[PDB]
Design a protein around this nucleic acid. Structure first.
Ligand SMILES: Nc1nc2c(ncn2[C@H]2CC[C@@H](COP(=O)(O)OP(=O)(O)OP(=O)(O)O)O2)c(=O)[nH]1
Ligand SMILES: [Mg+2]
Length: 579
DNA sequence: CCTGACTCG
DNA sequence: ATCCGAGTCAGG
């Protein structure tokens, strides 16, 4: 049905200046993964190329790297990074169908071309899973079957571009695609390929010392319990706590007794064993995930880890980070924080530089809600996380520890994003009446925030979606639901999404601005990671002074709000020391 | 394979 | 019933 040339060699007509390009990587983690086939669709026709042929062809490599030869693709970051591992530069990506679909509707969870095509009732292409299979059965099919699939995906991209661009334009999201998400994709590609260097000697020694400590804590828990059991089994643990030891049952889930951290903390007045168990479960996660799990994914020759930043996953416009997740490295407890000493610069005499937006969603909220009490607190450079702390612990602005401030930060965001008196009461282990009284006084200090949250909920019910500063959108069909729980969740998404998503928009723009700046000043410094409202770079020790001005500046100037954006920063010999 | 742990923003 | 957004892991 669909005619294409199964080419044995690259020809001139394949190198047109506009094309849909497919560079197929079957493995989910595309780092150093095989490219199994290439397809090109342009004005002159449809072509399948063998990677061995095409990627060793100097005209084709030239064309890939030519920014004036425009390519339309699906998930160009995947292709760009796979090509980098093949030592080939990909330039000229002008349209990314994945990112287009994601902006039109993040809820569709589009993750292959077929799923994007479905959005415009385009059905002349198969889902990847149907072609490659799943799990132990996953495999590249016979060449003619593979070639047709890749060509059909290219043909789909070729035909779907205008219809997607048109709809994006109708939604005012065209610039969000072309000026924000697509340039960010190339930047993330650079960051993933660069990777972050790991001190495996240090990590392995931490691991050995952690194993000894675990055994010690383990034995202590068995002594306290009067029995050996699997502490890492909530089921077995529940039997020990609520049957053998007869501690009060505070919560159940569908599977049985809850042994959540919140529940165990509340049981501390009944038996000291619950504090030891909380400690054990923390240490065990450090070992399984941040020592063993991390060492498993280190590339042994370079000692680097290469995360994948999923740019088309979260419902709010944030990135996520996978395999490994480098956006959830411990920091809150010193015991875990020490893992960060194993993340080091990739060159000698280089340093890690970390910058963090201050009270970021509180600033964005002030701007969007136009709450005058709040817009003012930032014009007076107040720290609302700390003030809240002083209040909930009756402790004053000098005595507030980082930990207390951390807790207050969850209270602040909790309240603005719709926590109930019950939730705040369970969170601070205080009485519900007191919690309710606190929420009351909070919205008295910031009446505009309260008005904004009431108004954005009604607007969501009327329109069926909410939007961010740069026109990112989330649909919320459930919000007019007759069901209280379903409706309630949707209402709180209406309160939170515009704010968290606007904050995502901002740091994304900041990353693009920051890179352009690094280049024009010919600095060696480059981004390693983004952590939602943090940017982490590495650079020669001599560029620290310049970065101390460049980075906070670019991040603060990414957008202009009705309040000051404020960025905190540090650098040091390891990520840990960048404090 | 999911659930409930722990981790982060 | 009860702030929001994420990922990985051991146990089952
Ligand atoms: N709904 C919600 N969002 C949170 C919570 N913690 C963090 N976030 C979101 C909101 C802020 C954003 C950044 O995290 P941070 O810890 O840096 O919070 P921050 O407000 O910027 O504080 P800081 O001034 O210390 O940098 O991520 C939380 O407990 N609930
Ligand atoms: Mg911050």
């Amino acid at each position: 049905k669909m005619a294409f040339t199964l080419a044995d060699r690259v020809t001139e007509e394949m190198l047109a200046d506009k094309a849909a390009l497919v560079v197929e990587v079957v493995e989910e983690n595309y780092h150093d993964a095989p490219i199994v086939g290439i397809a090109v669709v342009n004005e002159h026709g449809r072509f399948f190329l063998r990677p061995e042929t095409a990627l060793a062809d100097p005209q084709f490599v030239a064309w890939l790297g030519d920014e004036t030869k425009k390519k339309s693709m699906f998930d160009s970051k995947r292709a760009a990074v796979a090509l980098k591992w093949k030592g080939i530069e990909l330039c000229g990506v002008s349209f990314d169908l994945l990112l287009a679909a994601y902006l039109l509707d993040p809820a569709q969870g589009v993750d292959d071309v077929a799923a994007a095509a479905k959005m415009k009732q385009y059905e002349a292409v198969r889902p990847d899973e149907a072609v490659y299979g799943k799990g132990a059965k996953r495999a590249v099919p016979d060449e003619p079957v593979l070639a047709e699939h890749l060509v059909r995906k290219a043909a789909a991209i070729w035909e779907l571009e205008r219809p997607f661009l048109d709809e994006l334009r109708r939604n005012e999201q065209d610039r969000l695609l072309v000026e924000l998400e697509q340039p960010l994709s190339s930047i993330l590609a650079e960051m993933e390929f660069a990777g972050v260097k790991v001190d495996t000697k240090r990590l392995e020694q931490m691991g050995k010392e952690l194993a000894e400590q675990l055994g010690t804590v383990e034995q202590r828990i068995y002594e306290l319990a009067g029995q050996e059991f699997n502490i890492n089994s909530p089921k077995q643990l529940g039997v020990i706590l609520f049957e053998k030891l007869q501690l009060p049952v505070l919560k159940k889930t569908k599977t049985g007794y809850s042994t959540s951290a919140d529940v165990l903390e509340k049981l501390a007045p009944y038996h000291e064993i619950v504090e030891n168990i909380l400690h054990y479960r923390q240490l065990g996660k450090l070992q399984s995930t941040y020592i063993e799990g991390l060492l498993k994914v280190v590339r042994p020759a370079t000692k680097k880890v290469h995360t994948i930043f999923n740019q088309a996953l979260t419902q709010t416009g944030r990135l996520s980070s996978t395999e490994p997740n480098l956006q959830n490295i411990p920091i809150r407890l010193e015991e875990g924080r020490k893992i960060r000493q194993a993340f080091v610069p990739s060159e000698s005499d280089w340093l890690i530089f970390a910058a963090d937006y201050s009270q970021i969603e509180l600033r964005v909220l002030a701007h969007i809600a136009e709450d005058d009490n709040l817009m003012e607190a930032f014009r007076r450079d107040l720290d609302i996380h700390t003030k809240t702390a002083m209040d909930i612990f009756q402790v004053s602005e000098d005595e507030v520890t980082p930990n207390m401030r951390r807790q207050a930060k969850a209270v602040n965001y909790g309240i603005v994003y719709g926590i109930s008196d019950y939730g705040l009461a369970q969170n601070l282990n205080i009485s519900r009446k007191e919690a309710a009284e606190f929420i009351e006084r909070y919205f008295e200090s910031f009446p505009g925030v309260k008005r904004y949250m009431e108004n954005i909920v009604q607007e969501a019910k009327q329109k069926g979606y909410v939007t961010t500063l740069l026109h990112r959108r989330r649909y919320l069909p459930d919000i007019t639901s007759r069901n209280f729980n379903v409706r309630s969740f949707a209402e709180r998404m209406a309160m939170n999404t515009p704010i968290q998503g606007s904050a995502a928009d901002i740091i994304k723009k900041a990353m693009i601005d920051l890179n352009a700046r690094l280049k024009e000043e010919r600095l060696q410094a480059h981004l390693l990671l983004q952590v939602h409202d943090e940017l982490i770079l590495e650079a020669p020790k001599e560029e620290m002074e310049r970065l101390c001005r460049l980075v906070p500046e670019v991040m603060e100037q990414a957008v202009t709000l009705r309040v000051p954006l404020k960025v905190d920063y540090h650098y040091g010999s390891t990520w840990y020391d960048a404090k």
